[PDB]
């Protein structure tokens, strides 16, 4: 067996490492404009196998996004620390966000998805009923106008850029319905191919499965489009090791309950079948 | 001589026509469709991707883009330059069908130009004074290209869900990112909905021209235009005409020369652009 989708990812890593352009004083190798397709049919789920992906973090982060939260403490208290570095006192101060409490990411993903256009005050404020709920509107359009070419969720509001700890990387999403199947395309302005991309593929494939479930559709495809696709120079050796590994079949993902609505999912609803990755890679310095 | 980038476009037409999904659509005409495509067009050596297997309305590309840049949403300003491409979506009849009863004819609502130059400003009408209002994304992108060319955040969006009830037609070409490496400016545009027959050739030219303009004013060389599409479709009414086009071996693209030094994006004029050796096959109307 050969996992063509994962091999394609490894081939894109190889193209960046061997032929990418240096961009900086910390350095990357970079290319601009890539696209990959991941088949979600038969419940196959594109969780990469050549290096273990932090699946628990994928699930918890996505449920947190869906809830509309921008409070990284809520995620950290669930033992997922991936947003703690971008919401520390030191990082916030470095962005000039001196009045934000630690944990306040500003109006990032969850807020844009559920409350677009609402003025942001802080992560603890009530936003219920405020702003444009793009996530619910997309679900509505999938069900009411599946032919639509306008089923869009944006995370990009230039008016909010001064208020965010980090501008959203995964910033534009479109859904599509054909032949009883739901597909999703996500546009990512900036992608760390080594650490971010595998996690991000899983996040949006999971979102697609969740929405397909509550819209009574079968899963189609996840299409990942990238602007600046890059690898950090310090990671090149670890990625060279990873590229020598043989991808295994992807796992399957099952949803174990008839879930009521997009806000009703729980971590325990998701079963990953036969996920057998290689271990995470750590390369000691030698020079 | 053969043109590989145009051959790729023709191959995409063939795949949609032979294998696309039949969709009903907003217009009621019906389409063959695929979801998720990407193509790259090289802008090096002044080569300019104006398709050759049919004539593209170049004068309309230029005038429409200068109009976008100005921030205008008044289709009468284009129509008065004998560019009628937005007249159908801004007639009294169409505006009334969208519930836009108080718009004067010509008012497209807060579409491309308004979003590029005035994002977030409440829209009233096409004739209101928006000078200095909203977020000038176009000028901010140019500033970032000049001052922080390595940035991974050089973005212009045309999508504001809060404005969707005010527009005649929601923007099709709706997200743009710029990128600088090795002294070359590239641009990727995301198009949620692409009429492969009529729209796409025009849209490729529009964003390639914008990339050339911005490279020129920032003293960069042009790199690539990357076109990413959501719903790429062919209207059933277009299939026969597109079958004529797919039988043609594309010719090499023209070159585009910019004829004077221009320092600000708002300073370009139509006569600054010279299209060299554009040699299209006989026109195909749809
Ligand atoms: C941004 C965040 C993400 N998911 O939330 N995925 C990513 O891969 N990233 C990476 C891209 C880049 O290396 C860095 C963001 O820095 P810039 O804002 O300068 O692009 O994080
Ligand atoms: C929208 C406008 C454009 N340039 O201005 N390019 C395009 O190709 N279009 C096409 C896409 C589609 O056929 C139609 C818009 O209808 P929807 O809003 O229903 O997608 O125009």
Numbering used by the authors:
A (entry chain A): 18 to 41, 45 to 307
B (entry chain B): 18 to 303
What did the paper state?
Thymidylate synthase (EC 2.1.1.45) catalyzes the dUMP methylation reaction, involving N5,10-methylenetetrahydrofolate (meTHF)-aided concerted transfer and reduction of the one-carbon group, its products being thymidylate and dihydrofolate (DHF). N4-hydroxy-2′-deoxycytidine 5′-monophosphate (N4-OH-dCMP) is a substrate analog, reported to inhibit the enzyme from bacterial, avian and mammalian sources, as well as from certain helminths. Inhibition was found to be competitive with respect to dUMP, and apparently mechanism-based, as it showed meTHF- and time-dependence; the dependence on time pointed to the slow-binding inhibition. Novel evidence is presented allowing further clarification of the mechanism of the slow-binding thymidylate synthase (TS) inhibition by N4-hydroxy-dCMP (N4-OH-dCMP).
Structural results provide further evidence that such incubation, also with the parasitic nematode T. spiralis enzyme, results in the inhibitor molecule being covalently bound at the active center via the pyrimidine C(6) and Cys189 sulfur, with the pyrimidine C(5) non-substituted by methyl, but acquiring an additional hydrogen atom. An asymmetric unit contains a single TspTS dimer. Residues 18–41 and 45–307 of chain A and 18–303 of chain B were modeled. Within each of the two active sites a clear electron density was present, identified as the N4-OH-dCMP molecule. However, no electron density was found that could be unequivocally identified as a folate derivative molecule. Both N4-OH-dCMP molecules were refined with high occupancy (0.95 and 0.93 in subunits A and B, respectively), with each N4-OH-dCMP pyrimidine ring conformation pointing to sp3 hybridizations of the C(5) and C(6) atoms, and the distance between pyrimidine C(6) and Sγ of Cys189 suggesting a covalent bond to be present between N4-OH-dCMP and each of TspTS subunits. The C-termini of the subunits A and B are in the open and closed conformations, respectively (the last four residues in subunit B were not modeled due to poor and ambiguous electron density). The C-terminus of subunit A is stabilized by crystal contacts with several residues from the neighboring TS dimer. Finally, minor conformational differences between mTS and TspTS could lead to faster DHF release from the latter.
